[PDB]
Design a protein around this ligand. Structure first.
Ligand SMILES: *[C@@H]1O[C@H](CO)[C@@H](O[C@@H]2O[C@H](CO)[C@@H](O)[C@H](O)[C@H]2NC(C)=O)[C@H](O)[C@H]1NC(C)=O
Ligand SMILES: *[C@H]1O[C@H](CO)[C@H](O)[C@H](O)[C@H]1NC(C)=O
Ligand SMILES: [Mn+2]
Ligand SMILES: [Mn+2]
Lengths: 4, 234
């Protein structure tokens, strides 16, 4: 799960 | 045969052989503090700092087609207040003469989600898992992209001294990077091939970029010493  | 070399075991404020960018400063205690930090040591989110060696390095020559070999070594530490939530990381890199900071956070101030802006070659010490990343912190060799062409596991230690050695052999085009924590007696190592001619301009600057996390503090990054030596034969 990558952020932004 | 061109050569250059330098070394030191402290940094020193306002030293004019050093180009600072972003949040970078040199402390009175002689550390290259790459990230913004509050009064007691705690990193601020969306910090990014870079620092370059003043002198451009002649990395390859178009006329003769020859390529430089080189070696870089340095000690670095990090402070993470919460050891289970970490902040992107730190990298050693070569970039164009006029290189400026790129996207921060997970791109480490070195690359961008789009095609590109600079031509960058780097060895990353990556603490946070982005979508392009393998699981767990790692060392990586990055060639014009944040997606490392190869990675290996990196045995983090909060606060402890990491002794890095990075070498490039033009005769094999092999970039090799090793990390050692002498207090832990742990070692890590990585190697892959990289064509400098197709990934960098003839002249580059070398240096460090370190980014903290977007929404979170994560970890600060301090470089304590630095050596480099390079050789461009005919
Ligand atoms: C990595 O580099 C640093 C800085 O050169 C070394 O720490 C310094 O050396 C001695 C350690 O006993 C002290 O007098 C200094 O105050 C230290 N400086 C700083 C800024 O911390 C460190 O020992 C080196 N580690 C290695 C080569 O393993
Ligand atoms: C999103 O935030 C996290 C910290 O929570 C990391 O900094 C991560 O690298 C960020 N994502 C991107 C794409 O920069
Ligand atoms: Mn990452
Ligand atoms: Mn990575």
């Amino acid at each position: 799960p990558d952020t932004r | 045969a061109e050569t250059v070399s330098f070394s030191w075991n402290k940094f020193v404020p306002k030293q004019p052989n050093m180009i600072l960018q972003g949040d970078a400063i040199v402390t009175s205690s002689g550390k290259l503090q790459l990230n913004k930090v509050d009064e007691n040591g705690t990193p601020k989110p969306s910090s990014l700092g870079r620092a370059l060696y003043s002198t451009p390095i002649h990395i390859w020559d178009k006329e003769t087609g020859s390529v430089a070999s080189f070696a870089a070594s340095f000690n670095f530490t990090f402070y993470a207040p919460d050891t289970k939530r970490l902040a992107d990381g730190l990298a050693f890199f070569l970039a164009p003469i006029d290189t400026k900071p790129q996207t921060h956070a997970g791109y480490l101030g070195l690359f961008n989600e789009n095609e590109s802006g600079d031509q960058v070659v780097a060895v990353e010490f990556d603490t946070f898992r982005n979508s392009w990343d393998p699981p767990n912190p790692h060392i990586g060799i990055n060639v014009n992209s944040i997606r490392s062409i190869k990675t290996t596991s990196w045995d983090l230690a909060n606060n402890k001294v990491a002794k890095v050695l990075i070498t490039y052999d033009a005769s094999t085009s092999l970039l090799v990077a090793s990390l050692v924590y002498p207090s832990q007696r742990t070692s890590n190592i990585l190697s892959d091939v990289v064509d400098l001619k197709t990934s960098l301009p003839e002249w580059v600057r070398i240096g460090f970029s370190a980014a903290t996390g977007l929404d979170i503090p994560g970890e600060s990054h301090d470089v304590l010493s630095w050596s480099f030596a390079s050789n461009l034969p005919h």
